[model samples]
Structures are given as structure tokens and as C-alpha cells.
Target chain A: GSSGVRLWATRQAMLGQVHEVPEGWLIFVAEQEELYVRVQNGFRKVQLEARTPLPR
Target chain B: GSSGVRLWATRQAMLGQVHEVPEGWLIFVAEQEELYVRVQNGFRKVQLEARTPLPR
Candidate 1:
């Protein structure tokens, strides 16, 4: 991993935790909080850190 | 724009249409319908194409 990207999504909300930021994972969120972190092959789920509530 | 990747996420569902594939957009949907296509600095949102509901 090398690119640390992020984004916003449509409806279909979801919650996830960073789960210890990856060395090079991508973070994405939808209108409902669907958090997708780009991992191997593709992205994974865990919800936000539940601390500072980063903007997607 | 060089990797056409994909994956899944947590709850907080989100619907995305994908609006014409990108030159190098990374697709990844969490448990949700959140079709997050890793874009520039982050991701964008849009309902699904409303056709064959692809697997997240």
C-alpha cells in the first residue's frame, strides 16, 4: 500500500473502526457512515476510531 | 489513477451507481451497498445502477 485516499458515499450507511491504521490503506465513507478501508486485494471494514470522528 | 481495486466495509450502508468506470478507480463496498470508488483525495457517493445487484 502507498496511497492514503478517502471519500464519501451515497445512502446505505455503515459504521467502522480504523482498527490500527494500515501502513497504506485507503479510507472511504458514505452518507450513512459506511467506512471502507482499502486493504489487500481491496478494502475492509471496522468503523471509525470513535474518537475525533475524522471527516471520512 | 492506475489501480482498479475493490472490497467490502462495515455497516452504515450506502448505495452507489459507479457512473461509468474510471481510468483507474478503485471500487470497494463495505457490508453496506456503499460503492466507494477511491477517487482523487477521497471518495464520492451515488446509488447503484439499479440493475444486477453485484456482490459487495
Candidate 2:
């Protein structure tokens, strides 16, 4: 799956409910803590683009 | 674009999926007759949170 959705969805559920996350931003979380950290960095970039400058 | 994010979640997981679903929610599937009801009740109000839940 290009989305990697099937796998990603499982991880998020395990982490329990997360609130206030911005819409359409991808989070490439994994069981490995390092993966979580790595993905989180990219996530921040996406969030910043979607948020700062207020979406044009 | 506006807050439409991308057309809501998909229907492939409808009628529930193999994974467990929480009790406090209703499905907003991708199939016909329902593009996920727009959350008329419950949830306190409607909002889009990304990369979490059933991707719902």
C-alpha cells in the first residue's frame, strides 16, 4: 500500500487516542522508538508548512 | 483549500474491520449512500484530527 495505512493505523491505535493533531498530516510511527522520533521530525515539517503563514 | 483536508476516511474498513474499534464512535465510511455522515451528533462537535483513530 503506497499509504502504508494498514500498518500505520495499527501503531496509532496502540498509542491510544491523540487529540488536536492537524488534518491530513502524515505520521510514520513505528514500534521502534527511533522510528517514532525520525518520523516525528518529518511530521513537524509537514505541520509547519500546513500551519505557518496560515495556509495562504 | 479549506479545511476539507481530503475527502474524509475510506469505506474499505466498513461494517468494522478485523481490528478492534472503540465503542464511542460511528463509522464514516468511503462507500456510497454515506460519505461518513459528517458527525451530526456526539463527538461534542466536528473536527479533523490526522493520522489517528481508524483514520476515521
Candidate 3:
């Protein structure tokens, strides 16, 4: 993130792989340990999210 | 789905959550029980399988 850009890990996988949130996506971390993100894709409003990734 | 068309491709995770694979992502389920998914967001392909969810 040295280029004056901020990256967010929308979700992490079981093998320690992190899924970065898509650019321009509105990210909303929910109260129940879930993530809610949305963005305009083509003709539809695309929404995406994943439950909290387990910690190390 | 019981309907005509699948509005979205939903590949539920081991936890039974509606983790819709992102549009343009490549989905591959392996013999190891790991779900390998990725988009232009490369290298760090997502690994979503829980070794096994239920208690032994």
C-alpha cells in the first residue's frame, strides 16, 4: 500500500489466503462478523461479502 | 434452484452460507475438498474449504 492506496481484505480463506475487496465496492462490515459490499457491474447492482475468516 | 434461471451463481460454503462466487472468477473444486476460486485479482486464489465442519 505504498502508492497512496488502501486495500481491504474483504475475506480470508482457510489456508491463510486473503480476498481483497474489489475496487469501488462499498464495503460494510456487519455486526454479526459478516462483510457486505456492493458495486455497479454492467446492468446489475452487484453485492458481495463473506463471513469472518477464522484467526490464526 | 427451483426457479427458471439462476440469477446468480451461488456456491455455498461448508458453513452453508451463500458465498456467491464473484463474477468473472474461475471456480474449481479439488479432490482435497478445497474450493479454488479466483478473478483478475490473481495469485492469491481463494481457498474456502473447511477441513470438515462437523465435530468428529
Best by TM-score: 1
Give the alpha carbon lDDT tens digit for every residue of B1-56 in model 2: 21221222445544334133333333332222121212333222222233212323
Candidate 3 is graded, for docking, as incorrect
Give the CAPRI class of candidate 2.
incorrect
Against the true structure, what is each candidate's TM-score? 0.29, 0.19, 0.22
Candidate 2 DockQ vs. native: 0.03
Q: Which candidate tops lDDT? A: 1
Model 3 chain B scores worst on lDDT over the 10 consecutive residues at B1-10
Using lDDT as the measure, what is the rank order of every candidate, best first? 1, 2, 3
Pick out the ten consecutive residues of candidate 1 chain B with the lowest summed lDDT: B11-20
- TM-score (C-alpha, index-matched) for candidate 1: 0.29
**i-RMSD of all predictions:** 11.8, 12.0, 16.6
DockQ of 3: 0.03
Model 3 vs truth, CA RMSD: 16.9
Kindly list the per-residue Cα lDDT of model 3 for residues A1-56, writing each as its tens digit: 00011223442331132233222222232333332222122111113466467998
